[PDB]
Each structure stands twice: as C-alpha cells, then as structure tokens.
Design an enzyme around this catalytic site. Structure first.
Site, PDB file in Angstrom:
ATOM      1  N   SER B   1       0.796  -1.185  -0.023  1.00 16.79           N
ATOM      2  CA  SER B   1       0.078  -0.121   0.060  1.00 16.79           C
ATOM      3  C   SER B   1       0.803   1.068  -0.119  1.00 16.79           C
ATOM      4  CB  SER B   1      -0.985   0.140   1.406  1.00 16.79           C
ATOM      5  OG  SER B   1      -1.876  -0.746   1.330  1.00 16.79           O
ATOM      6  N   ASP B  73       5.317  -4.049  15.072  1.00 16.68           N
ATOM      7  CA  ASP B  73       5.318  -5.292  15.853  1.00 16.68           C
ATOM      8  C   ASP B  73       4.364  -5.003  16.970  1.00 16.68           C
ATOM      9  OD1 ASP B  73       5.619  -7.565  17.235  1.00 16.68           O
ATOM     10  OD2 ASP B  73       7.729  -7.800  17.323  1.00 16.68           O
ATOM     11  N   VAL B  75       2.286  -7.727  18.151  1.00 14.65           N
ATOM     12  CA  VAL B  75       2.123  -9.338  18.426  1.00 14.65           C
ATOM     13  C   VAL B  75       3.202 -10.112  18.867  1.00 14.65           C
ATOM     14  CG1 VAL B  75       1.008 -11.246  17.538  1.00 14.65           C
ATOM     15  CG2 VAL B  75       0.149  -9.138  16.666  1.00 14.65           C
ATOM     16  N   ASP B  76       2.938 -10.471  20.125  1.00 16.79           N
ATOM     17  CA  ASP B  76       4.113 -11.243  20.717  1.00 16.79           C
ATOM     18  C   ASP B  76       3.617 -12.526  21.126  1.00 16.79           C
ATOM     19  OD1 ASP B  76       5.957  -9.327  20.567  1.00 16.79           O
ATOM     20  OD2 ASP B  76       5.963  -8.616  22.665  1.00 16.79           O
ATOM     21  N   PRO B 205      11.773  -8.835  20.827  1.00 21.68           N
ATOM     22  CA  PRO B 205      10.458  -8.860  20.198  1.00 21.68           C
ATOM     23  C   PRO B 205      10.252  -9.740  18.780  1.00 21.68           C
ATOM     24  CG  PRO B 205      11.245  -6.815  19.558  1.00 21.68           C
ATOM     25  CD  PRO B 205      12.217  -7.373  20.530  1.00 21.68           C
ATOM     26  N   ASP B 252       7.665  -8.615  13.341  1.00 16.17           N
ATOM     27  CA  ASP B 252       8.701  -9.697  13.526  1.00 16.17           C
ATOM     28  C   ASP B 252       8.530 -10.686  12.439  1.00 16.17           C
ATOM     29  OD1 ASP B 252       6.870 -11.668  14.227  1.00 16.17           O
ATOM     30  OD2 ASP B 252       6.577 -10.932  16.141  1.00 16.17           O
TER      31      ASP B 252
HETATM   32 CA   LIG Z   1       6.640  -9.816  18.265  1.00 20.91          CA
END
Ligand SMILES: [Ca+2]
Lengths: 207, 557
Positions: B1, B73, B75-76, B205, B252
């Site tokens: 995008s 990032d 989301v872990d 991360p 990540d």
């Molecule tokens: Ca992560």
C-alpha cells in the site's frame, strides 16, 4: 423529518445518505450496502466468523476452524455492550438498514434476490451489531493487524546456532532478520524525530 | 500500500495534495465501497473496504485522510508452561491458572459437522501446543480489547476539522496502521497509529517470551511514543509499507524487513525530481510506480562494476548494457502479452541465481527456501497483491553494499569468493537460460508481461461471486486496489477541495435472478486500466447536479 432518510445515487451509482440522527444515517448506509453488495457482504460475514463450510462444503472446514481459533467472540460482544447509546446507534442503525433491504429481498426473491444465492443454494439472513463489527474486526484486526512469525523465527535461530554455534548463529539471525537497520528509508526524516526505545537483540528473555 | 501527501511547500497550484493507493489485491465485486454520509454531524465522501461504518479513504471538505498498513510489531507469542498432571492449566505468577475454553461446531454443507475446542490464557488464544515439551503458545495482541474502539475511532475521525481533533481519534485507533492527514490550509500530517506493548527490559520482540509472569508486558506505551509528524520540513509524506521513523522496529515476520533496499525510494525519486508537483503530476506517480521494476536501481551498479572490464562481445556485458539503457519502466508490446524490454526477465533470472548462490546457501534447510524468491513470483492470473523487493534480495543488497551497510555480515554470503566472480557466474547462468529460450538476438526477445485479475474469491480464498465474474486486465500495475486523490485550495478553482477516486469494477455487484447485471457492475473497469478517475462529490449542489436516482425512506427506530 427525524424519520426521513434521503438516498441520492450519482452517475456511477455511488450513494449519498441524508439523515438527521446517528441511527438513521447508518441505517441508510446499511440499506444501500445491502442493495449493492449483499452476496459479497454475506460471504464476508461467513469469512469473518468461520461459517463458510455451512454453505460451501468440506473444502472450507479447516478455513472455518482457523478463523474461530483466532478470536474470542464473547470479548467482542462485551466491547459492544460497553458502548454509549450514540456509539451503539452506528452499529445498530447499519444492521437495521441492511435488514430492511434483506427483508424486501426475501419477500420478492423472484426479482430481488442476487443470482449468486440461487447459484450457491441458500438465502440471506438478518444482521446484528456484532456481525457489522466483525466485518471490520475479522478483516482489519484478525487478519491485517495480526502478523507474527515468532515460533518460526525461533526455529530458524535454533537451526542457525546448530550450524554456526551459539554466538555466530545469533549474529547470523541478526543479519537475516535484523531488529532495526539505520539505512532504512523512513517516512519521518531523522531531522524531525527518531524513536527513543532500544530493544534487546539477543533473545535475552531465555538467557 | 502506498501514499504520498504533498504539503504547501511542495504543491503547485494548490496548498496540499493527498494520493493514496491501498493494496489489498483485486476482486470482483470491488474491494471498496463508494459512499457519502451527510447529517448527524457528518459531511463526508470517499470509499472504504467492505463498506465499514468509517471511511478509510475520504474527506469532509475541511480535512482529508487515508491509510497504509503499519506493520509495527504489535504481536508477541507467550510460551505457556503446562503440566501433564493438570490438563487445561498453566503456570502464571506462581499459581496454576485455569485456561478459558469454548466449544465450536462447524456445520458442513453435504457433510458431517466437526466440533473442536478453542483455548485462551491471560496472554491470548492458544495457537499450538507441544505435548512433548508441555508448552502451549499464546498469541498476545496489543490491541486485544480495543477492536471496536478502533472501528469507532475510524468513524469519529471523519468529523475532525483540525489536526488536534483528528489526532484525538488517531490515539483511539489500536491496530498497526499508518494514518495520514491533509487540510484546506495546506497542513499535512502522519501518525503510525496503534497500541504497542511496553516490554520488559531484555525482551527481544522477534522471539517468544516465557508465559510464567516475569516477561509479561508492563502495559501499553502512551500515544506520545507513536511515530508522528505534522508539517515536515521536507514538504511531503511518502510511504510504501516502509519504516515510519529512524530506530522504529518492524513486524517480526521473517519475510518482512525495513532496510537499505526499499521500494518507497521510487516514490521519493519522483517527488524530488521537480521542486513542486501539480495534482496531475502527483496522480501520474501512480502510473510510473505501477510500471517500475523495483530491482533495477538496487542491482544495476553491482552489475555495471562486475562487467566493466569485459570485451564488447561478452554476453554477460551485453545483458548489462541492455539494462543500463533502460529506466525500468515496463510497457506492453502491441500484442498485449509481452513487454517491450526484456530487463525484468534478465533481473529475475540473475537474482534467482544470485540468491541460490548466496543467502540460500548460507541458511540451513528448510529455512533456505524463505530466501530463494526473487519477488517476480506470480501466476498466469498475475500477482495476487503488490510487488516488492524480496527478503532475500534485501539481505543480498546489504551484502553487495560492503562496508556501506550497517548490518554486520556475520556470515560472508559470498563464501570467500570475490563478489564480482559470483555476479558474473549468475550472469553466465542468465545468458544460458534466456538465450536457449529466446535465441541470441536480445533485440527481438519478447518476454512475458504480467497480467492482472479481479478475482471472484475474496482475500480469504472464499467465493464472493461466481467464477465467471472474474475480470481480467492485460497490464499488471503495482498500484492501489483503488486510488483516490484530494486536492486542497486549488488555485484553478474557487472550491476549497477537489477529489477523485476509482472503484473497479464498479459500485454495484448486483446481478438479478435472470442474469441481468446492474448498470453500475462494470463501468469503472476501463477507467481503472487507463489510469482514469471519477469525481467524488460532497456538497448538496454537486450531488444534485450529478444525480441519477433518489429514494426517500420514512422510518421509526
Ligand atoms: Ca513480536
């Protein structure tokens, strides 16, 4: 006049909604959406909730499981219940407008039912605020804003330490999947600002 | 995008220009929905994915807005400690805590239903479990709990009349998304919106964290930390899924990197070519970026250095001469099937050979396959989304920059050989491959062009139309699924704003029971292909002047 909703379509069919309160405005939006894109919306509903195999069969079972496994629908319903009346009116009005048109479709299907329902062998059902919320939530959140590969990353790091040793393997991971690279072109120039946080880059959570 | 926002100091014959090209792939019926909303505090026009209540692409006559995916990032994954003695529990803060669970039944047309259980911990839903190591992985999203707030922030931002009003709603949007602003006075702005975790010290991360309690997030970072800029001194804001800001970390995902090789540079080159850009010049950036080979700029200098001392008759040198004469813009021959120049095929073959000899050979199997793609992968129906520089190519670019790269080359991807040797060997492979297919006269090579398909399956792979409603376009274009442009304070009109978009194949997906397609089922397809655009109306008088039909409803809640 509080009950009045005016819909104007332009020369490309684009609808313009005129109304005097929140519920009525979003009702007109839902109504035009159900006229223009009902099959698309119904299939987006099924995609976002994992109910595709109900209509398309066994090839979509794994799909449906994977969608349901990736969210907690009761949590979404709890966020909806916490909304103020004004906010709830956006979702409720939209659902109510789609349903006004769906009910017309199901009353005169011989001329108003999109052909694809006949091809695919089913008929459209009404919508609630949760379904409208899940079109967004299941596309923008559960798919587009939900990207991680940390379990695969750890398997690559383990394979690199097995090939190169613990230290060189960590350093090769930092070469292939660097945390930050100062030569990356940045939308904000460095003269303006820089991000102030520095992150661990050697998997110290398990050290 | 992609997106380019041109402010007062860079705009010609206007105070600000916003041009957005969100890339979601191509579908029939259209990915986005055109809509204008007027009343109850709103006065807006634009188009938006799946008809969401909030318009992602649009304006209100005072400000305009748009978005590109953020790829921060957010989301872990937490590795939960299980116990075979206590099925359904995990260890957290010194206590065995019960997982939440729910049963789901999948009903199946013409088949047997299947029931399964979804599990969830304090860190999120369980993705997978390893019975052998008594570990379950839970996916933690910083926006968990804020999904509905994010939908409403995207709606309420449509009423903002200034930067402060608009950023108040940007601070309530929790997904990782770049948001963009422009206004009638020529102000422009950007916020890399979303919720991001405040991680413990030592938390890398990119990799999972223990779920036993000590590695739990501290909370969420405040909105002051989100990358943002208002009226940058450059005069513009450009993005093509590239980093927001110096030292800001990417997603990540192993196949995603922000490094020296980035396709956004193609947009910067066009914005900096001339001092100011008119609206027509800003729109033409779509056509040029759409057709631009992304690898030529990155690798041509390496290819020129490697072939500089070769004789005129050496085919490895002649392939490079062919590239040097080219600007990397692909154009179709008259057949509507092949490209006028063969450079993308030369680059694809060479890069594929280079990656096999370098990054792929340094990575253990089966991970080596993550680094083998050249980026020119597609299908006879053409690319399913944007084209980019591949992850392997981005890592190879740091290697070929030598000590100009800031990334330590912990493993020499050239395995002790001079880089020129490997570059030339991949050129010999390239000449062998291509001359066997096309013959030895490069000037007559008619290499295949990529095409574009409006798919009748949505991005999930689920039918949203019958297969025969798929639409085809001869020219693949690396551009927005839709494109929209907003011009503020033009000097060529007295109107404070002018705006345009394109929603292909058309506004309507309706087909009547007898097969009769709606009048607006396909009336924007040719306009899309030819880089055309239609006017977005906002005022009551402009809407009325272009009215085709109207309905008046009388409804009680
Ligand atoms: Ca992560």
């Amino acid at each position: 006049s509080s009950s009045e909703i005016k819909i104007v379509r332009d020369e490309y069919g684009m609808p313009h909604i005129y109304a005097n309160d929140t519920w009525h405005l979003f009702y007109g939006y839902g109504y035009v959406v159900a006229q223009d894109r009902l099959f698309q919306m119904e299939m987006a509903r099924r995609s976002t909730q994992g109910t595709v195999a109900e209509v398309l069969g066994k090839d979509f079972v794994k799909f449906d499981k994977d969608i349901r496994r990736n969210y907690w629908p009761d949590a979404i319903r709890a966020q909806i219940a916490a909304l103020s009346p004004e906010d709830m009116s956006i979702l409720q009005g939209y659902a109510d407008g789609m349903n006004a048109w769906i009910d017309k479709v199901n009353t005169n299907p011989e001329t108003l039912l999109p052909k694809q329902f006949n091809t695919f062998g089913f008929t459209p059902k009404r919508w609630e605020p949760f379904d409208v919320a899940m079109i967004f939530v299941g596309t923008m959140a559960n798919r587009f804003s939900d990207s991680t590969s940390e379990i695969d990353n750890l398997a690559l790091l383990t394979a690199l330490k097995d090939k190169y040793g613990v230290s060189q393997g960590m350093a090769v991971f930092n070469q292939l999947k660097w945390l930050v690279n100062p030569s990356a072109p940045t939308t904000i120039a460095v003269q303006e600002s820089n991000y102030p946080l520095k992150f661990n880059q050697q998997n110290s959570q398990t050290a | 995008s992609n997106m380019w926002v041109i402010g007062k100091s860079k705009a010609q014959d206007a105070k600000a220009i916003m041009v957005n090209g969100p890339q979601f792939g191509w579908y029939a019926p259209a990915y986005t929905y055109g809509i204008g909303l007027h009343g109850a505090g709103y006065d807006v026009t634009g188009n938006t994915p799946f008809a969401y209540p909030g318009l992602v692409f649009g304006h209100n006559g005072v400000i305009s807005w748009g978005s590109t995916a953020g790829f921060g990032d957010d989301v872990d994954i937490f590795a939960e400690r299980l116990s075979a003695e206590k099925p359904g529990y995990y260890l957290h803060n010194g206590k065995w805590v019960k997982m939440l669970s729910r049963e789901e039944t999948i009903t199946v047309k013409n088949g047997q239903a299947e029931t399964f259980t979804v599990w969830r911990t304090v860190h999120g839903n369980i993705l997978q479990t390893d019975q052998t190591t008594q570990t379950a992985y839970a996916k933690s999203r910083a926006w968990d709990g804020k999904e509905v707030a994010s939908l409403l922030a995207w709606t309420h931002q449509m009423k903002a009349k200034n930067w402060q009003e608009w950023t108040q709603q940007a601070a309530k949007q929790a997904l990782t998304i770049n948001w963009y602003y422009a206004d009638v006075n020529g102000n422009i702005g950007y916020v890399h919106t979303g919720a991001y975790p405040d991680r413990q010290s030592g938390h890398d991360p990119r990799l999972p964290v223990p779920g036993t309690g000590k590695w739990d997030w501290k909370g969420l970072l405040p909105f002051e930390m989100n990358p943002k800029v208002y009226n940058p001194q450059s005069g513009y804001i450009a993005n093509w899924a590239n980093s927001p800001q110096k030292d800001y970390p990417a997603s990540d995902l192993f196949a995603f990197l922000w490094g020296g090789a980035d396709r956004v540079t193609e947009i910067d080159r066009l914005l900096e070519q001339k001092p100011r850009l008119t609206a027509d010049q800003a729109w033409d950036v779509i056509r040029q970026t759409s057709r631009q080979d992304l690898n030529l700029r990155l690798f041509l200098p390496t290819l020129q250095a490697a072939t500089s001392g070769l004789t005129q008759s050496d085919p490895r040198r002649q392939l490079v001469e062919t590239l040097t004469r080219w600007d990397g813009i692909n154009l179709l021959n008259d057949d509507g099937k092949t490209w006028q120049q063969p450079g993308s095929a030369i680059l694809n073959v060479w890069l594929t050979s280079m990656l096999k000899r370098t990054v792929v050979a340094a990575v253990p199997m089966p991970f080596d396959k993550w680094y083998s793609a050249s980026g020119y992968e597609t299908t006879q129906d053409g690319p399913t989304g944007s084209l980019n520089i591949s992850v392997g190519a981005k890592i190879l670019y740091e290697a070929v920059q030598g000590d100009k790269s800031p990334i330590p080359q912990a493993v020499d991807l050239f395995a002790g050989k001079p880089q020129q040797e490997v570059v030339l060997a991949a050129l010999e492979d390239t000449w062998e491959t291509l001359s066997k297919r096309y013959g030895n006269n490069v000037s007559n090579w008619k290499t295949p062009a990529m095409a574009l398909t409006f798919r009748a399956n949505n991005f999930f792979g689920v039918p949203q139309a019958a297969a025969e409603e798929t639409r085809h376009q001869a020219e693949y274009q690396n551009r927005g699924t839709e494109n929209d442009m907003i011009v503020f304070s033009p000097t060529t009109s007295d109107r404070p704003v002018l705006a345009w978009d394109v929603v292909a194949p058309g506004q309507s997906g309706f087909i009547a029971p007898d097969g009769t397609v709606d009048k607006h089922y396909e009336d924007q397809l040719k306009m899309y292909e030819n880089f055309g655009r239609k006017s977005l109306w906002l005022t009551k008088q402009d809407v009325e002047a272009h009215k085709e039909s109207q309905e008046v409803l009388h409804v009680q809640r």
